């Protein structure tokens, strides 16, 4: 099941703490679907964190 | 690299849309992404001076 | 033709004839690649001579269907000829840095002519291709390697890396299945490249297609004749145990060696034509 | 006959089996039947000498 992939990416690749999750954050709720389909690059977690930062920034823009 | 990077086959970059592999290839030597704006010879002269 | 076995149930027989009926529809055409069509010959459930005879008949039907499905070579060779003449004319009209080193390689490109055999075609296309790619490298003024006794690698020039992965996926699919064709939906013509570079990209696509088809067909036919000869050797050394009428008839029909394709053809014909003599010699189930 | 027999689609051989058309081809001139063990040159010069 994909639930294990979601918890694996959010606890290994993202290092997101427990109080923030896809049930609490809609930008994670829309980026989980594009973080499952990426298979490689899991050694470099920093690139995934930077992509998540720029997505949560561009979601919170008034322009 | 050892070969020139002349044509538009190597350079492309989006902004605002999620683009993780251009960040995975950040610090790699090959692709050289660009902001899709070519400044004219006037601003080129200005940058030079 | 009724490729008739001796031991299995009729579902296995119609499964094998459906497999050989639909070789060309199936990708990765190889007997070692498909496990279940190879182990449906009846290993460890039947005796040794019967499963080896059925495997021999399987390989002979396989080689008959391999000869049957016609790897054609007219269109690819005439397109290679018109394309090599076209890239020669694009080389004469193009201004390079220096003209003598481009000139003798263009002269090499003018000597791309073929015979009716294909053994020399697969070695003349590599010299045509190294000449075409060094014209491609010198036309954009990129640094080619110049080590002592060094060869230029057969590479696509000025393409996107995902397009390189897609075209190598297509050429690997040619390497797995020689008869089947997968369409090249990608257009090689790009506005960001010179017409000479487009011509060389079409040349290297055609030449790599030719080389992959010839290499895959060659290893397939040598492999299958080798396995047929090993199987018939196993049959003639296992038929030495019984000395009867029908076992000796099967030994005399397994006497003919299989070094040629028509030898395999006539061996399959005179094996299945006189089938009912030797069938009582082999133990079933 | 008038035609060169070097077309290899005319030659065949079978031994120790019930080949009736080979026995039809007795006193027949067109299909030549030659065993599938062709002699090499070393056993060719011995036959010649």
Short mmCIF file of C-alpha atoms in Angstrom, two decimals:
data_model
loop_
_atom_site.label_atom_id
_atom_site.label_comp_id
_atom_site.label_asym_id
_atom_site.label_seq_id
_atom_site.Cartn_x
_atom_site.Cartn_y
_atom_site.Cartn_z
CA UNK A 1 0.00 0.00 0.00
CA UNK A 2 1.01 3.61 -0.65
CA UNK A 3 0.50 4.63 3.00
CA UNK A 4 3.86 3.11 3.89
CA UNK A 5 5.47 5.05 1.04
CA UNK A 6 3.89 8.26 2.34
CA UNK A 7 5.06 7.73 5.91
CA UNK A 8 8.49 6.64 4.67
CA UNK A 9 9.00 9.76 2.58
CA UNK A 10 7.69 12.10 5.28
CA UNK A 11 9.84 10.52 8.01
CA UNK A 12 13.05 9.79 6.06
CA UNK A 13 13.19 12.20 3.15
CA UNK A 14 11.35 15.18 4.60
CA UNK A 15 12.05 14.81 8.36
CA UNK A 16 8.76 16.55 9.00
CA UNK A 17 7.74 16.46 12.69
CA UNK A 18 4.57 14.74 13.79
CA UNK A 19 2.33 17.76 14.47
CA UNK A 20 2.46 18.67 10.76
CA UNK A 21 1.24 16.07 8.30
CA UNK A 22 -0.82 15.65 5.15
CA UNK A 23 -3.96 15.67 7.28
CA UNK A 24 -2.85 19.10 8.52
CA UNK A 25 -1.24 20.60 5.42
CA UNK A 26 -2.84 20.78 1.96
CA UNK A 27 0.42 21.50 0.15
CA UNK A 28 1.72 18.19 1.47
CA UNK A 29 -1.64 16.70 0.52
CA UNK A 30 -1.00 17.74 -3.07
CA UNK A 31 2.75 17.07 -3.15
CA UNK A 32 2.59 13.52 -1.78
CA UNK A 33 1.17 12.44 -5.15
CA UNK A 34 4.25 13.79 -6.92
CA UNK A 35 6.67 12.59 -4.27
CA UNK A 36 5.55 8.97 -4.58
CA UNK A 37 6.29 8.77 -8.30
CA UNK A 38 9.91 9.91 -7.84
CA UNK A 39 11.84 6.72 -7.13
CA UNK A 40 15.48 7.81 -6.99
CA UNK A 41 17.15 10.86 -5.33
CA UNK A 42 16.28 9.63 -1.84
CA UNK A 43 19.87 9.84 -0.66
CA UNK A 44 19.82 13.63 -1.22
CA UNK A 45 16.99 14.68 1.07
CA UNK A 46 18.04 18.34 0.86
CA UNK A 47 16.73 18.74 -2.69
CA UNK A 48 13.33 17.42 -1.63
CA UNK A 49 13.27 19.79 1.32
CA UNK A 50 14.13 22.72 -0.96
CA UNK A 51 11.41 21.77 -3.42
CA UNK A 52 8.92 21.52 -0.56
CA UNK A 53 9.97 24.96 0.72
CA UNK A 54 9.59 26.60 -2.67
CA UNK A 55 6.21 24.94 -3.19
CA UNK A 56 4.88 26.07 0.19
CA UNK A 57 6.22 29.54 -0.61
CA UNK A 58 4.59 29.70 -4.04
CA UNK A 59 1.33 28.39 -2.60
CA UNK A 60 1.34 31.29 -0.12
CA UNK A 61 1.81 34.08 -2.68
CA UNK A 62 -0.77 36.77 -3.44
CA UNK A 63 0.43 37.31 -7.01
CA UNK B 1 32.56 20.61 -19.93
CA UNK B 2 35.03 19.42 -22.58
CA UNK B 3 32.42 20.06 -25.25
CA UNK B 4 30.76 23.41 -25.96
CA UNK B 5 27.24 24.03 -24.73
CA UNK B 6 26.10 25.94 -27.80
CA UNK B 7 22.53 24.91 -28.79
CA UNK B 8 19.31 25.11 -26.79
CA UNK B 9 19.42 21.36 -26.10
CA UNK B 10 21.01 21.71 -22.66
CA UNK B 11 19.31 24.74 -21.03
CA UNK B 12 15.75 25.01 -19.66
CA UNK B 13 14.37 26.10 -16.27
CA UNK B 14 10.92 26.70 -14.80
CA UNK B 15 10.03 28.95 -11.87
CA UNK B 16 7.12 28.53 -9.48
CA UNK B 17 6.25 25.03 -10.67
CA UNK B 18 7.77 22.09 -8.77
CA UNK B 19 11.02 21.11 -10.45
CA UNK B 20 12.99 18.75 -8.22
CA UNK B 21 15.53 17.34 -10.79
CA UNK B 22 16.89 20.79 -11.59
CA UNK B 23 17.66 20.96 -7.88
CA UNK B 24 19.06 17.44 -7.90
CA UNK B 25 21.30 18.49 -10.79
CA UNK B 26 22.20 21.67 -8.93
CA UNK B 27 26.05 21.66 -8.49
CA UNK B 28 26.32 19.18 -11.36
CA UNK B 29 28.43 20.46 -14.21
CA UNK B 30 26.46 19.56 -17.34
CA UNK B 31 22.99 21.15 -17.79
CA UNK B 32 23.41 24.90 -16.96
CA UNK B 33 19.82 26.02 -16.60
CA UNK B 34 18.88 29.55 -17.68
CA UNK B 35 16.13 32.02 -16.77
CA UNK B 36 14.76 32.22 -20.37
CA UNK B 37 15.62 35.88 -20.92
CA UNK B 38 18.30 37.11 -23.30
CA UNK B 39 19.35 40.65 -22.51
CA UNK B 40 19.96 42.86 -25.53
CA UNK B 41 23.29 44.39 -26.50
CA UNK B 42 22.36 47.58 -24.64
CA UNK B 43 22.04 45.87 -21.25
CA UNK B 44 25.00 43.73 -22.28
CA UNK B 45 27.04 46.92 -22.70
CA UNK B 46 25.71 48.16 -19.37
CA UNK B 47 26.70 44.94 -17.56
CA UNK B 48 30.12 45.05 -19.22
CA UNK B 49 30.85 48.59 -18.20
CA UNK C 1 2.41 -28.43 -40.83
CA UNK C 2 1.61 -30.43 -37.68
CA UNK C 3 4.55 -29.95 -35.30
CA UNK C 4 3.63 -33.11 -33.44
CA UNK C 5 5.19 -33.97 -30.08
CA UNK C 6 5.06 -37.33 -28.31
CA UNK C 7 4.38 -36.91 -24.60
CA UNK C 8 2.36 -33.89 -23.57
CA UNK C 9 -1.37 -33.20 -23.40
CA UNK C 10 -3.08 -31.44 -26.29
CA UNK C 11 -3.37 -28.17 -24.34
CA UNK C 12 0.43 -28.01 -24.27
CA UNK C 13 0.53 -28.72 -28.01
CA UNK C 14 -1.91 -25.96 -28.90
CA UNK C 15 -0.11 -23.65 -26.45
CA UNK C 16 3.20 -24.29 -28.24
CA UNK C 17 1.63 -23.81 -31.67
CA UNK C 18 0.01 -20.60 -30.41
CA UNK C 19 3.40 -19.47 -29.12
CA UNK C 20 5.07 -20.12 -32.47
CA UNK C 21 2.07 -18.64 -34.28
CA UNK C 22 2.55 -15.44 -32.27
CA UNK C 23 6.30 -15.05 -32.00
CA UNK C 24 6.33 -11.74 -33.86
CA UNK C 25 3.54 -10.27 -31.73
CA UNK C 26 5.46 -11.17 -28.59
CA UNK C 27 8.42 -9.01 -27.54
CA UNK C 28 11.70 -10.43 -26.15
CA UNK C 29 11.74 -13.32 -28.61
CA UNK C 30 14.06 -15.89 -27.05
CA UNK C 31 13.50 -19.36 -25.68
CA UNK C 32 15.77 -18.78 -22.70
CA UNK C 33 13.91 -15.54 -21.99
CA UNK C 34 10.52 -17.25 -21.83
CA UNK C 35 10.66 -19.79 -18.97
CA UNK C 36 7.20 -21.33 -19.10
CA UNK C 37 7.26 -22.12 -22.82
CA UNK C 38 10.59 -23.89 -22.29
CA UNK C 39 9.65 -25.88 -19.19
CA UNK C 40 6.33 -26.94 -20.71
CA UNK C 41 8.40 -29.48 -22.66
CA UNK C 42 7.91 -31.85 -19.72
CA UNK C 43 11.05 -31.81 -17.61
CA UNK C 44 11.29 -34.13 -14.53
CA UNK C 45 7.82 -35.58 -15.26
CA UNK C 46 8.72 -37.58 -18.38
CA UNK C 47 11.80 -39.63 -19.23
CA UNK C 48 15.03 -38.21 -20.62
CA UNK C 49 14.83 -39.25 -24.27
CA UNK C 50 11.25 -38.03 -24.68
CA UNK C 51 11.81 -34.59 -23.15
CA UNK C 52 14.97 -34.20 -25.20
CA UNK C 53 13.13 -35.21 -28.38
CA UNK C 54 10.35 -32.74 -27.64
CA UNK C 55 12.90 -30.01 -26.92
CA UNK C 56 14.59 -30.82 -30.23
CA UNK C 57 11.27 -30.53 -32.05
CA UNK C 58 10.62 -27.25 -30.22
CA UNK C 59 13.96 -25.81 -31.31
CA UNK C 60 13.45 -26.97 -34.90
CA UNK C 61 10.03 -25.35 -35.06
CA UNK C 62 11.64 -22.28 -33.51
CA UNK C 63 14.32 -22.10 -36.19
CA UNK C 64 11.72 -22.68 -38.89
CA UNK C 65 9.67 -19.76 -37.57
CA UNK C 66 12.85 -17.67 -37.31
CA UNK C 67 13.62 -18.32 -40.96
CA UNK C 68 9.95 -17.85 -41.78
CA UNK C 69 9.48 -14.29 -40.58
CA UNK C 70 11.75 -12.57 -43.13
CA UNK C 71 14.15 -9.88 -41.83
CA UNK C 72 13.94 -7.55 -44.84
CA UNK C 73 16.81 -5.30 -45.84
CA UNK C 74 15.92 -3.32 -48.98
CA UNK C 75 14.30 -0.20 -47.50
CA UNK C 76 16.91 0.32 -44.80
CA UNK C 77 19.79 0.00 -47.25
CA UNK C 78 18.30 2.35 -49.84
CA UNK C 79 17.46 4.88 -47.13
CA UNK C 80 21.04 4.57 -45.86
CA UNK C 81 22.34 5.19 -49.38
CA UNK C 82 20.15 8.24 -50.03
CA UNK C 83 20.94 9.54 -46.55
CA UNK C 84 24.71 9.08 -46.96
CA UNK C 85 24.64 10.88 -50.30
CA UNK C 86 22.54 13.61 -48.68
CA UNK C 87 24.95 14.11 -45.79
CA UNK C 88 27.85 14.13 -48.26
CA UNK C 89 26.17 16.96 -50.18
CA UNK C 90 25.47 18.72 -46.89
CA UNK C 91 29.14 18.32 -46.07
CA UNK C 92 30.38 19.85 -49.31
CA UNK C 93 28.14 22.89 -48.93
CA UNK C 94 29.09 23.44 -45.32
CA UNK C 95 31.95 25.67 -44.20
CA UNK C 96 34.23 24.05 -41.63
CA UNK C 97 37.40 25.28 -39.98
CA UNK C 98 39.87 23.38 -42.15
CA UNK C 99 38.97 21.69 -45.39
CA UNK C 100 41.50 18.91 -46.00
CA UNK C 101 40.71 16.90 -42.88
CA UNK C 102 37.02 17.38 -43.56
CA UNK C 103 37.68 16.59 -47.21
CA UNK C 104 39.21 13.13 -46.90
CA UNK C 105 36.51 12.12 -44.43
CA UNK C 106 33.94 13.34 -46.93
CA UNK C 107 35.80 11.21 -49.47
CA UNK C 108 35.41 8.26 -47.09
CA UNK C 109 31.72 9.13 -47.01
CA UNK C 110 31.63 9.01 -50.81
CA UNK C 111 32.88 5.42 -50.73
CA UNK C 112 29.82 4.05 -48.91
CA UNK C 113 28.65 1.40 -51.37
CA UNK C 114 27.30 -2.05 -50.53
CA UNK C 115 27.24 -5.58 -51.93
CA UNK C 116 24.45 -8.15 -51.86
CA UNK C 117 25.83 -9.88 -48.76
CA UNK C 118 25.35 -8.26 -45.36
CA UNK C 119 28.59 -9.41 -43.69
CA UNK C 120 30.51 -6.47 -45.15
CA UNK C 121 27.62 -4.04 -44.70
CA UNK C 122 27.84 -4.18 -40.89
CA UNK C 123 31.55 -3.34 -41.07
CA UNK C 124 31.33 -0.61 -43.71
CA UNK C 125 28.61 1.22 -41.79
CA UNK C 126 30.96 1.67 -38.86
CA UNK C 127 33.48 3.53 -41.01
CA UNK C 128 30.64 5.51 -42.61
CA UNK C 129 29.41 6.31 -39.13
CA UNK C 130 32.73 7.40 -37.68
CA UNK C 131 33.21 9.66 -40.71
CA UNK C 132 29.70 11.09 -40.26
CA UNK C 133 30.16 11.74 -36.56
CA UNK C 134 33.54 13.42 -37.03
CA UNK C 135 31.92 15.68 -39.61
CA UNK C 136 29.25 16.36 -37.00
CA UNK C 137 31.89 17.14 -34.41
CA UNK C 138 34.02 19.33 -36.65
CA UNK C 139 31.01 21.18 -38.09
CA UNK C 140 30.07 22.69 -34.72
CA UNK C 141 33.76 23.01 -33.73
CA UNK C 142 33.67 20.75 -30.70
CA UNK C 143 36.79 19.09 -29.34
CA UNK C 144 37.10 15.50 -30.52
CA UNK C 145 39.53 13.18 -28.76
CA UNK C 146 42.91 12.72 -30.43
CA UNK C 147 44.73 10.04 -28.50
CA UNK C 148 47.19 7.81 -30.33
CA UNK C 149 45.31 4.88 -31.83
CA UNK C 150 41.96 6.21 -30.61
CA UNK C 151 38.52 5.71 -32.11
CA UNK C 152 35.56 8.05 -32.00
CA UNK C 153 32.52 6.58 -30.21
CA UNK C 154 29.31 6.22 -32.19
CA UNK C 155 27.27 8.91 -30.46
CA UNK C 156 24.23 11.04 -31.17
CA UNK C 157 25.11 14.72 -31.45
CA UNK C 158 23.32 17.76 -29.93
CA UNK C 159 20.31 16.02 -28.42
CA UNK C 160 18.44 16.25 -25.15
CA UNK C 161 19.34 13.58 -22.62
CA UNK C 162 15.78 12.35 -22.17
CA UNK C 163 15.63 12.07 -25.96
CA UNK C 164 18.87 10.07 -25.77
CA UNK C 165 17.26 7.76 -23.20
CA UNK C 166 14.14 7.36 -25.34
CA UNK C 167 16.09 6.60 -28.51
CA UNK C 168 18.32 4.10 -26.70
CA UNK C 169 15.18 2.48 -25.28
CA UNK C 170 13.90 2.10 -28.84
CA UNK C 171 17.21 0.68 -30.06
CA UNK C 172 17.27 -1.77 -27.16
CA UNK C 173 13.75 -2.82 -28.11
CA UNK C 174 15.11 -3.45 -31.59
CA UNK C 175 17.90 -5.49 -29.95
CA UNK C 176 15.36 -7.68 -28.15
CA UNK C 177 12.90 -8.15 -31.03
CA UNK C 178 14.38 -8.09 -34.53
CA UNK C 179 11.15 -8.54 -36.48
CA UNK C 180 8.82 -6.21 -34.59
CA UNK C 181 8.84 -2.45 -35.16
CA UNK C 182 8.13 0.21 -32.55
CA UNK C 183 7.29 3.58 -34.12
CA UNK C 184 9.59 6.57 -33.67
CA UNK C 185 7.09 9.19 -32.58
CA UNK C 186 10.00 11.54 -31.82
CA UNK C 187 10.87 13.97 -34.59
CA UNK C 188 14.61 14.25 -35.09
CA UNK C 189 14.34 17.64 -36.82
CA UNK C 190 15.02 20.46 -34.38
CA UNK C 191 15.19 24.15 -35.21
CA UNK C 192 18.08 24.65 -32.77
CA UNK C 193 20.38 22.44 -34.85
CA UNK C 194 21.93 22.81 -38.27
CA UNK C 195 20.62 20.72 -41.17
CA UNK C 196 23.95 18.89 -41.26
CA UNK C 197 23.47 17.83 -37.64
CA UNK C 198 19.95 16.62 -38.46
CA UNK C 199 21.32 14.57 -41.36
CA UNK C 200 24.02 13.01 -39.17
CA UNK C 201 21.43 12.17 -36.51
CA UNK C 202 19.31 10.39 -39.12
CA UNK C 203 22.45 8.60 -40.34
CA UNK C 204 23.40 7.38 -36.89
CA UNK C 205 19.83 6.24 -36.19
CA UNK C 206 19.77 4.22 -39.42
CA UNK C 207 23.26 2.80 -38.91
CA UNK C 208 22.66 1.76 -35.32
CA UNK C 209 19.38 0.15 -36.41
CA UNK C 210 21.28 -1.81 -39.09
CA UNK C 211 24.01 -2.87 -36.66
CA UNK C 212 21.56 -3.94 -33.94
CA UNK C 213 19.42 -5.95 -36.39
CA UNK C 214 22.43 -7.75 -37.85
CA UNK C 215 24.02 -8.44 -34.45
CA UNK C 216 20.81 -9.73 -32.87
CA UNK C 217 19.94 -11.94 -35.85
CA UNK C 218 23.48 -13.33 -35.97
CA UNK C 219 23.64 -14.27 -32.30
CA UNK C 220 20.12 -15.73 -32.46
CA UNK C 221 20.87 -18.00 -35.42
CA UNK C 222 24.24 -19.13 -34.06
CA UNK C 223 22.71 -19.81 -30.64
CA UNK C 224 19.80 -21.81 -32.04
CA UNK C 225 21.95 -23.93 -34.37
CA UNK C 226 24.29 -24.61 -31.44
CA UNK C 227 21.45 -25.76 -29.19
CA UNK C 228 19.99 -27.92 -31.99
CA UNK C 229 23.36 -29.61 -32.54
CA UNK C 230 23.80 -30.22 -28.81
CA UNK C 231 20.26 -31.63 -28.57
CA UNK C 232 20.74 -34.02 -31.49
CA UNK C 233 24.06 -35.13 -30.01
CA UNK C 234 22.24 -35.90 -26.76
CA UNK C 235 19.61 -37.84 -28.73
CA UNK C 236 22.12 -39.95 -30.63
CA UNK C 237 24.08 -40.77 -27.51
CA UNK C 238 20.92 -41.67 -25.59
CA UNK C 239 19.55 -43.80 -28.44
CA UNK C 240 22.68 -45.95 -28.27
CA UNK C 241 21.20 -47.77 -25.26
CA UNK C 242 18.31 -49.35 -27.19
CA UNK C 243 19.10 -51.42 -30.29
CA UNK C 244 15.78 -52.05 -32.01
CA UNK C 245 14.27 -51.31 -35.39
CA UNK C 246 12.58 -48.00 -34.64
CA UNK C 247 15.39 -46.69 -32.45
CA UNK C 248 17.79 -47.36 -35.32
CA UNK C 249 15.44 -45.55 -37.71
CA UNK C 250 15.47 -42.59 -35.35
CA UNK C 251 19.27 -42.77 -35.17
CA UNK C 252 19.59 -42.77 -38.96
CA UNK C 253 17.26 -39.79 -39.26
CA UNK C 254 19.25 -38.08 -36.49
CA UNK C 255 22.48 -38.80 -38.40
CA UNK C 256 22.22 -35.68 -40.60
CA UNK C 257 24.23 -32.83 -39.10
CA UNK C 258 22.66 -29.41 -38.73
CA UNK C 259 25.34 -26.93 -39.82
CA UNK C 260 23.09 -25.23 -42.39
CA UNK C 261 19.59 -23.78 -42.32
CA UNK C 262 18.28 -26.02 -45.09
CA UNK C 263 19.80 -28.98 -43.27
CA UNK C 264 17.62 -28.09 -40.28
CA UNK C 265 14.71 -27.66 -42.68
CA UNK C 266 15.04 -31.10 -44.28
CA UNK C 267 15.74 -32.63 -40.86
CA UNK C 268 12.44 -31.27 -39.57
CA UNK C 269 10.63 -32.38 -42.74
CA UNK C 270 11.94 -35.94 -42.67
CA UNK C 271 11.48 -36.07 -38.92
CA UNK C 272 7.79 -35.15 -39.00
CA UNK C 273 7.09 -36.93 -42.30
CA UNK C 274 8.09 -40.39 -41.07
CA UNK C 275 7.03 -39.75 -37.51
CA UNK C 276 5.02 -42.88 -36.77
CA UNK C 277 7.97 -45.28 -37.09
CA UNK C 278 10.12 -44.15 -34.16
CA UNK C 279 7.36 -42.97 -31.81
CA UNK C 280 6.92 -46.40 -30.21
CA UNK C 281 10.61 -46.50 -29.25
CA UNK C 282 10.39 -43.56 -26.89
CA UNK C 283 8.80 -44.01 -23.46
CA UNK C 284 5.82 -41.76 -22.79
CA UNK C 285 4.74 -40.31 -19.41
CA UNK D 1 22.28 -31.78 -68.08
CA UNK D 2 22.17 -28.36 -69.72
CA UNK D 3 21.83 -26.61 -66.37
CA UNK D 4 24.64 -26.19 -63.82
CA UNK D 5 23.88 -28.18 -60.70
CA UNK D 6 25.54 -25.65 -58.37
CA UNK D 7 22.02 -24.62 -57.27
CA UNK D 8 22.15 -26.35 -53.89
CA UNK D 9 18.34 -26.65 -53.97
CA UNK D 10 18.70 -29.73 -56.20
CA UNK D 11 20.94 -31.84 -53.93
CA UNK D 12 19.91 -33.92 -50.92
CA UNK D 13 20.82 -37.22 -49.31
CA UNK D 14 19.36 -39.71 -46.87
CA UNK D 15 20.83 -42.99 -45.63
CA UNK D 16 19.32 -45.91 -43.76
CA UNK D 17 15.76 -44.57 -43.98
CA UNK D 18 12.78 -45.34 -46.19
CA UNK D 19 13.50 -42.85 -48.96
CA UNK D 20 11.24 -44.02 -51.76
CA UNK D 21 11.77 -41.00 -54.11
CA UNK D 22 15.52 -41.61 -53.99
CA UNK D 23 14.65 -45.05 -55.32
CA UNK D 24 12.44 -43.40 -57.89
CA UNK D 25 15.45 -41.32 -58.91
CA UNK D 26 17.46 -44.34 -60.03
CA UNK D 27 18.39 -43.81 -63.71
CA UNK D 28 17.24 -40.18 -63.33
CA UNK D 29 19.56 -37.36 -64.28
CA UNK D 30 18.27 -34.12 -62.79
CA UNK D 31 18.36 -34.53 -58.96
CA UNK D 32 21.88 -35.41 -57.91
CA UNK D 33 22.25 -37.06 -54.52
CA UNK D 34 25.46 -36.43 -52.59
CA UNK D 35 26.22 -37.45 -49.00
CA UNK D 36 26.45 -34.75 -46.34
CA UNK D 37 30.13 -35.35 -45.67
CA UNK D 38 32.01 -33.28 -48.20
CA UNK D 39 35.65 -34.22 -48.59
CA UNK D 40 38.30 -31.75 -47.53
CA UNK D 41 41.30 -30.93 -49.70
CA UNK D 42 43.69 -33.31 -47.94
CA UNK D 43 41.47 -36.28 -48.74
CA UNK D 44 40.93 -34.70 -52.16
CA UNK D 45 44.60 -34.68 -53.16
CA UNK D 46 44.92 -38.29 -52.01
CA UNK D 47 42.02 -39.32 -54.24
CA UNK D 48 43.56 -37.35 -57.12
CA UNK D 49 46.99 -38.86 -56.70
#
